[PDB]
Amino acid sequence: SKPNIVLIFADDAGFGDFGFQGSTQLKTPNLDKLAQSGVRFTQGYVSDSTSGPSRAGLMTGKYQQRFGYEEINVPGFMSGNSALKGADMGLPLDQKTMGDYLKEQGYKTAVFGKWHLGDADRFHPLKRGFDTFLGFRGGDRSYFNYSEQEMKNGNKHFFDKKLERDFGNYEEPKEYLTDVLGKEAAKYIEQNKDEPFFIYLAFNAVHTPLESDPKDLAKFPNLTGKRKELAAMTLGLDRASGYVLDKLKELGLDDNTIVVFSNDNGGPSDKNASNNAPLAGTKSNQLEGGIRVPFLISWPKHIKPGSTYDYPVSTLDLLPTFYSAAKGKALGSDIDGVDLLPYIQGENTARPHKVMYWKKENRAVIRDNDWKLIRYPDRPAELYDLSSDISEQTDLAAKNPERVKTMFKSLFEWELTLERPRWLLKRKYEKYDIDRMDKYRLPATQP
Amino acid sequence: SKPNIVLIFADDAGFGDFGFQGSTQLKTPNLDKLAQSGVRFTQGYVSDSTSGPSRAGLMTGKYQQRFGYEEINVPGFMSGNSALKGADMGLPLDQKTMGDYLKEQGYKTAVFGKWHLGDADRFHPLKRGFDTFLGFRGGDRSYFNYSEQEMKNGNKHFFDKKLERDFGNYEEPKEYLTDVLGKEAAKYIEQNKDEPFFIYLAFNAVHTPLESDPKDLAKFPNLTGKRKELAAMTLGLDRASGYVLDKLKELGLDDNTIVVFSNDNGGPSDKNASNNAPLAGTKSNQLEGGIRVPFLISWPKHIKPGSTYDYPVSTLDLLPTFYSAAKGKALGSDIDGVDLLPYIQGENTARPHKVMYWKKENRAVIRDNDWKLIRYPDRPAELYDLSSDISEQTDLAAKNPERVKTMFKSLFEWELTLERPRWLLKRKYEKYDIDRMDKYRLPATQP
Ligand SMILES: O=S(=O)(O)O[C@@H]1[C@H](O[C@H]2O[C@@H]3CO[C@@H]([C@H]3O)[C@H]2O)[C@@H](O)[C@H](O)O[C@@H]1CO
Ligand SMILES: O=S(=O)(O)O[C@@H]1[C@H](O[C@H]2O[C@@H]3CO[C@@H]([C@H]3O)[C@H]2O)[C@@H](O)[C@H](O)O[C@@H]1CO
Ligand SMILES: [Ca+2]
Ligand SMILES: [Ca+2]
Ligand SMILES: [Cl-]
Ligand SMILES: [Cl-]
Ligand SMILES: [Zn+2]
Ligand SMILES: [Zn+2]
């Protein structure tokens, strides 16, 4: 029978900020049990170090730069010269989503929480292969209800923060947003328990603003300031994930449900006190700390519990993995991801991806097996062996000049397959991205 | 007394394709006499290796990337994702031109020939500080008249090729276009001989298409194919320049006229058989062959004949040089060029520009004294000492790693002062630009 699919996708979480990732300071008991129920990927990657492009890759199974979704869509952050601004920045309409492909296979489809794939009506999830929505079009919002005064005083971009049911039915959350999203996902499972369903549960946790349930804050008496708020927000994320995992268990659906847990980008250590241990870097740089994310898959009928998979995988792999599981036999020729199940099961012992790519303007990465070439606008290209240097502290470029040259040529060959970007950030954000990378250049460690 | 100013600006000429630049094969007797009458710059630079951005720099005295004019405006070559296309690509209206500054000093101002600073009415020379125009809005056109059928049946961009008098009075050339432009400039001098005037004579010679006066072709029986056409087109450019220089001499105006001769970008050796000897590279790359140009200034009242100046200078310097000569005392604080006259006269013995910059997307150059750092998307950054290696054959990056790092940081610091581009080329043109660079990577020789 066609399995249910639940994709749980956090925002701005630290690589080290889960029990199953080695945290003793933060508590994620429900997600730790999910990790134990299935396979944990030690080298799971997003397709970009920021939210919008990462989600564009996830939703399409494609390198998002191929359709010009290169720089992040943040209304108010965009160049005065940007081709598209405000509500016009969105996943191009000619792209086929995860939702569209699973609808073709007879699935009920729903998205809860953060969309961030366009604010205009034409970009709405209910036009992009989702039957049901409760969430917000934009990129960040309060974990509590906005007052009438806050909504009346919002700038022209503020409307994308409003919580929305299906197509334009605006309704603020009645309790802590993380709990609302988890309970709504659980209600959807209950309502659709007799048919195949796909849920995209896109928490805004643990993105700013740093707002928590006071009862969650009170569980971390020894933490202070931003770190205390992150701990409480992480406990909330884990509890709300628990509502969904517990509903699957209670209804006897979890055996034939694919549950994925991942994260849209590396932790912004300066904004939400996220910790990417043992990685260097953060959100919005292409060090491991920005692009490597917590990544779990559970499917009890096909995946051994307590297992780990150690070759690189991508969120780009999730569309073809889901589509294959849904018995799909008409996958677009343009898909960059691969079906992971044969790799997870050990039927295919090769690497899912020999070569992987990242790009924002002049900043780009080509990875070939465990060699990682990083290109920058402001310093010579660096070469890392990730098999011996997870924290990217030992530059090998000078000692491997032929490999640097061949990897440079391969990177540019891939860049020639991309469209020009559809929108551009203000110039100042490139200084911020590089300065934050240099601030977090040393390996992070568990506290 | 305020001097007359005549700026003669060729298109796509080879660095070596003039008598005064060391050609024995090509004939430029009028421009050779101009060189002998004044100062020849051995290190004269444009602000970009392509027409539009080069002209935007020339016309403003500013790094054109500071107002987003980074990639060339060619209607039909632009990305489907480009912010501006067709007639909307043009010199931003908030920029003050050479024309505007000289109009403030009580000059009559005229442009003849190629404009290429925007096709829409609002970008027209008569809105940008020019009283008089005979030329074409766009980037290239036939040296002979278009028929009514050719003009009626052109694609939607073709109208920018039509020869135009002042504001929208269309009239095709009655003779070889190079002769028309030179004679019209000479008539303007005659009509305005009793008052200060500024003429911008922007020849389309020696840009494609390769069309010549048959009488000029017949002077080069020993040359064949594209090189024979270039020789004839170059003879025409030199003759038409002669009409202007001879009119100044005949009316007794040349003593107190500043005559400048330069070129919009390096020779496209693969298109018009231009030869950039002794330089490596071409049009649309940032090797010396793309950015270094023939550069002459004559002003008999102030500049010694037969002189050479060997420190780097820029077309960016021409606006402040002209404005100072016109007795201007209110130069904008935003000007990147300097007044060259004190440097030419030896009053200021320093370099006009210690640090110079070039940029198109990932391709950029920072020059510091005679050190040149070249950044590429597809190979490690290279370092040249131009004082010992004019042809950029000996990469010194490996032996000077501290200087590579410091120059990289300085380059990026300048990039942070720029706007994002206002329009973007189709991706395929970056492959063309890099492949042509590699084809002409060796030094050119006379041939
Ligand atoms: O998680 S998001 O990427 O969506 O967060 C963004 C924003 O973060 C960005 O800010 C600029 C643009 O790209 C880089 C940085 O240079 C990225 O970190 C975040 O600061 C803001 O609070 O929310 C938006 C989403 O709305
Ligand atoms: O001299 S021009 O640059 O104005 O000539 C251009 C064009 O040359 C360009 O073509 C693409 C875009 O940038 C590079 C190259 O990658 C530059 O060489 C030339 O081929 C064409 O014939 O005329 C246009 C101007 O209309
Ligand atoms: Ca995020
Ligand atoms: Ca040109
Ligand atoms: Cl951030
Ligand atoms: Cl060309
Ligand atoms: Zn005279
Ligand atoms: Zn004289």
Author numbering:
A (entry chain B), B (entry chain A): 27 to 473
Question: What does the paper behind this entry write?
Answer:
The polysaccharides in red algae (Rhodophyta) are primarily mixed galactan agars such as agarose and carrageenan. Carrageenans are high molecular weight polymers having a linear backbone of repeating D-galactopyranose units (G) linked together by alternating α-1,3 and β-1,4 linkages. Furthermore, transcriptomics revealed upregulation of the CarPUL during growth on ι-carrageenan, while biochemical analysis of eight CarPUL-encoded enzymes revealed carrageenan-specific activity, thus associating the CarPUL with the ability of these pseudoalteromonads to liberate energy from carrageenan. Detailed analysis of the enzyme activities encoded by the CarPUL, combined with interpretation of growth phenotypes, have allowed us to propose a refined and detailed model of κ- and ι-carrageenan processing by some Pseudoalteromonas species.
Subsequently, we determined the structure of S1_19B in complex with intact κ-NC2 substrate. This was enabled by the use of a mutant that was inactivated by a serine substitution of residue C77, which would otherwise be matured to the catalytic formylglycine (FGly) residue. Each of the six S1_19B C77S monomers in the asymmetric unit contained a single intact κ-NC2 molecule with continuous density occupying the active site pocket and spanning the catalytic machinery. The serine residue replacing the proto-catalytic cysteine was positioned ~3.5 Å below the targeted sulfate ester mimicking the position of what would be the catalytic FGly residue. The non-reducing end DA residue in the −1 subsite interacts with the hydroxyl groups of carbons C2 and C4 and with the oxygen of the 3,6-anhydrous bridge through a direct and water-mediated hydrogen bond network. F103, Y455, and Y458 create an “aromatic shelf” aiding in the positioning of the DA unit. Notably, this mode of recognition necessitates binding the non-reducing end of the oligosaccharide, not internal chain binding, indicating a specific exo-mode of substrate recognition. Overall, the data support assignment of S1_19B as an exo-G4S κ-carrageenan sulfatase that is specific for the non-reducing end of κ-carrageenan oligosaccharides.
